[PDB]
Amino acid sequence: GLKAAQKTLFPLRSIDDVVRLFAAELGREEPDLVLLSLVLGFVEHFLAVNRVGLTYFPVADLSIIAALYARFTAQIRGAVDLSLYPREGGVSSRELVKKVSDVIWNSLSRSYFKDRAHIQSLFSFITGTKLDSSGVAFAVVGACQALGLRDVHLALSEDHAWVVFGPNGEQTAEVTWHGKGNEDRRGQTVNAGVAERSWLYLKGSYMRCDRKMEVAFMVCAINPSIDLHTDSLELLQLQQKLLWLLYDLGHLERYPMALGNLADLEELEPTPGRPDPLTLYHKGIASAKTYYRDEHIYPYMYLAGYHCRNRNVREALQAWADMATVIQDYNYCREDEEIYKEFFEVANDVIPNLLKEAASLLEAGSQGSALQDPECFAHLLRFYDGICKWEEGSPTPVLHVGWATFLVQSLGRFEGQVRQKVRIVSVPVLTFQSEKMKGMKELLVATKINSSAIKLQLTAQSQVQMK
């Protein structure tokens, strides 16, 4: 049962009408996740997946949306008999959460590409029987709301989603898959992953959503992609307007990644009278420092990316150095491969390209070049230091010889006279945390870097060729 007050804005005839619906729901005791996800999925389908016939905006008629809502609530209420799972004290049981997870899981198409765009929403679940990884977690939370289970909430790391529930909201349960070819842990807590200090569980400093943050998640989950070359302007506008709505109400306060998304949108198409992208990226970092012990990587990656795109080399290097300063206190574990790929691409592709362009510009007489700034060299060294310290104590190594040629090249982009200015001190001035960089210190100021010795010190390799 949609309530009478939920129906009065239909039909939705524009972006702004969708925004009004979100504003109305966010003003309610609890925003209706099912309704809002169905609307977003409907509007995304007809703006990104199939634009045949589009003349302005795909009008969302109440009859259509209500029929979709009824399919969802019918399935869930039919398959989950709450009488089998008595609720001690206004809180849900692990068995109940697992049952809801199973109902969503078991509904899905037997075989489909899980990496497709536009399979995030309950519209996808209902019309295509398809969901992406995190979409399954959202759908479990939407189903639990539909069942009246006020204590079940979405939990988010930077690369995974699960639920919290139970007495004081203190229980965790896996409800979806992560990655590819990992083994399902649905029903289990996340405690092993927290205890092993993996990036995937953020040492426990992950997001525990309220209902409003769950709305923010579905908005971040909007995918404006039409194809590899084209985005939907309509969906970008919608996402941007919804994020500002949430921002103004306070619901992005504890959501760094949403703040960075909003900053990226503002760079693309600034809203008059709003904060600059940089202000927003800094707010994201502040959010991570305030609520999550400064244990998140992506607030710094968002900032660095902005600086990189705008060829602020100094500030890009500083932000990637900061990114490494966070990662150093993690152990690199089996399902952390996405953050490995991000650091690998920065070290072995992005930074080299940036420094190569800097080198051409210096040849053409640029002033205040990062390549002549010793604090820029210090940032490069701190980036590598953090990666090396990350590797310390980890169950799987990080560095290999495929990193070493890029390190030598990048070091060599700074002339010896620049490199000499950095003073490396023990516990521009820099202090290394990692044993690998401490051993590398003397190699760092020679006019021509000793490539071979660098390679030996960065990697496990301890011998040179026999012959």
């Binding site: 990496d115 497709r116 765009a117 990644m257 990656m301």
Partner: peptide
Amino acid sequence: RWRFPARPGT
């Protein structure tokens, strides 16, 4: 393609 909601980059 698929990326985790609000992950930076592409």
